[PDB]
């Protein structure tokens with residue numbers, strides 16, 4: 177049992193994608209998670225994009241958990257250097273049919289009022305109280321307070337290549353971030369037991385958010401574009 | 414305490430390096446692990462390059478194991494496509510003062526007669542009986558029969574960037590292989606307890622080998638050049 181899909185680009189109204197909130201697909205075929213007006217990213221924005229069909233990460237009958245690999249490219253343009261860009265984007269796995277959570281530093285995946293479990297890889301650009309220096313890659317399990325963190329220098333407006341791989345046998349989740357224009361490579365990994373955190377079926381996708389109004393800083397924003405995305409999951413039973 | 418060294422280039426008569434067997438440094442300052450004459454790689458060649466000073470990966474007094482990160486660039490040119498290039502190169506950690514092992518598929522790190530422990534990351538180009546398709550990256554522990562394997566397409570003559578990171582707290586060894594000219598990224602990781610496999614002090618370096626004469630194939634060869642190499646390790650206490 178191996179499921180998989182590929183998006184070399186995104187078309188308007190893909191029957192395979194479920195867009196929520198501010199998420200939208202541009203004319204250029206790019207998935208814009210957060211609002212961008214007349215070429216300018218806006219604040220107080222939150223958006224998600226989930227693969228329409230649910231994927232089975234583990235089977236309770238056999239006890240087997242799936243191994244998977246996903247690759248995508250994104251771009252984050254920060255037009256306004258000061259006071260501070262925000263907030264970042266994440267790739268996440270969550271139960272089916274969840275609704276966008278809180279924006280801001282919660283990226284739209286954490287819902288303080290009705291929390292749902294999730295595993296996510298974040299590309300954090302704003303330093304909240306619970307954060308280390310930014311930008312940083314983080315591995316999140318049921319919380320925005322990362323288990324592991326690693327700093328990286330953003331290629332403003334440049335393209336970033338990401339590879340996330342999960343090996344069920346070792347329970348290792350390793351992510352690689354590469355900025356081809358700079359030739360920089362960033363790596364991070366951690367042990368995560370998906371069977372202990374998530375239900376048998378889940379949704380996979382992205383979520384991002386720009387500055388929250390409470391910070392009263394309209395400049396706290398940036399773009400969160402996904403240029404391409406491939407996903408492959410393998411369940412031995 | 415934390416050891417650290419960097420080789421942005423290799424200078425002939427490199428004081429901080431122990432070259433063994435066919436390993437030598439060209440005029441262009443590249444580390445040629447295996448024999449190349451008049452611009453042509455030869456068979457029946459084996460060579461290693463070790464950092465002259467030993468590094469302490471763990472301390473028996475505190476029980477602490479070191480975390481480390483090493484980055485290097487290599488190039489493998491395969492002049493003769495048919496019948497089959499061989500054999501590949503590896504980055505390895507072994508006890509101090511070891512001597513080049515068997516060539517061929519053993520890369521010069523495995524000594525059937527008098528075996529010594531070692532952890533190595535291989536870039537295998539020839540398919541031996543114990544191998545999956547080639548080329549492939551492999552994680553080796555005391556043996557050339559990899560614990561984990563992942564296939565990759567070689568950029569013939571191109572430059573390859575490698576990042577190997579070891580996190581003592583999680584015991585995760587993750588390696589990233591990138592071919593900038595192709596934009597391809599390959600990743601692999603596994604759990605390895607260095608404290609259970611290696612002595613407190615070790616040597617770090619590279620080793621490679623070309624086709625073994627027993628195969629009666631002079632075309633079973635390729636180059637194994639190391640363009641640059643940086644290493645950093647942190648042993649707390």
Ligand SMILES: *[C@@H]1O[C@H](CO)[C@@H](O[C@@H]2O[C@H](CO)[C@@H](O)[C@H](O)[C@H]2NC(C)=O)[C@H](O[C@@H]2O[C@@H](C)[C@@H](O)[C@@H](O)[C@@H]2O)[C@H]1NC(C)=O
Pocket residue numbers: 220389
């Ligand atoms: C941030 O976005 C919110 C929605 O994404 C804004 O609220 C929405 O405002 C629309 C126009 O007023 C209204 O049609 C929507 O129903 C409403 N959504 C809800 C229920 O929150 C929010 O600002 C709102 O509108 C301004 C004019 C004020 O009335 C605010 O008090 C509202 O929340 C946006 N935040 C800000 C302050 O820009």
Ligand SMILES: *[C@@H]1O[C@H](CO)[C@@H](O[C@@H]2O[C@H](CO)[C@@H](O)[C@H](O)[C@H]2NC(C)=O)[C@H](O)[C@H]1NC(C)=O
Pocket residue numbers: 457626
């Ligand atoms: C592979 O290389 C070895 C070593 O160069 C060749 O065997 C001989 O090894 C002895 C070591 O005591 C040297 O003194 C000889 O000079 C080596 N051969 C010669 C005369 O060059 C071995 O023959 C090589 N394999 C083949 C078939 O070419």
Ligand SMILES: CCO[C@@H]1O[C@H](CO)[C@H](O[C@H]2O[C@H](CO)[C@H](O)[C@H](O)[C@H]2O)[C@H](O)[C@H]1O
Pocket residue numbers: 262263280281282302304305386387388389390391392393396
């Ligand atoms: C010490 C707490 O920090 C401040 O928290 C504020 C609201 O709780 C603001 O943070 C919010 O807005 C910023 C953008 O201005 C980000 O979107 C944060 O993620 C969001 O919580 C303020 O900016 C913080 O300094």
Ligand SMILES: CCO[C@@H]1O[C@H](CO)[C@H](O[C@H]2O[C@H](CO)[C@H](O)[C@H](O)[C@H]2O)[C@H](O)[C@H]1O
Pocket residue numbers: 499500517518519539541542623624625626627628629630633
């Ligand atoms: C299935 C057995 O394969 C053959 O094994 C031979 C020796 O056991 C030869 O392999 C040796 O030489 C080749 C060069 O062509 C490589 O260097 C191998 O690593 C080495 O063991 C023969 O080539 C194999 O087909």
Ligand SMILES: *[C@@H]1O[C@H](CO)[C@@H](O)[C@H](O[C@@H]2O[C@@H](C)[C@@H](O)[C@@H](O)[C@@H]2O)[C@H]1NC(C)=O
Pocket residue numbers: 255256257258259393394395
């Ligand atoms: C938000 O971004 C714009 C565009 O880069 C900046 O010009 C703003 O700077 C602020 O306004 C200008 C006119 C000047 O007074 C400067 O001192 C201010 O900092 C910037 N505004 C914020 C919120 O920093």
Ligand SMILES: *[C@@H]1O[C@H](CO)[C@@H](O)[C@H](O[C@@H]2O[C@@H](C)[C@@H](O)[C@@H](O)[C@@H]2O)[C@H]1NC(C)=O
Pocket residue numbers: 492493494495496630631632
């Ligand atoms: C070894 O590589 C060279 C360079 O590509 C090839 O020319 C050889 O091809 C074979 O041998 C030559 C002499 C010629 O007869 C050709 O028709 C053969 O295919 C190649 N030899 C091997 C080991 O296959």
Ligand SMILES: [Ca+2]
Pocket residue numbers: 263281300301302303304307
């Ligand atoms: Ca944050």
Ligand SMILES: [Ca+2]
Pocket residue numbers: 500518537538539540541544
């Ligand atoms: Ca081999």
Ligand SMILES: [Mn+2]
Pocket residue numbers: 298300307308312314320322
């Ligand atoms: Mn964070």
Ligand SMILES: [Mn+2]
Pocket residue numbers: 535537543544545549551557559
């Ligand atoms: Mn192998």
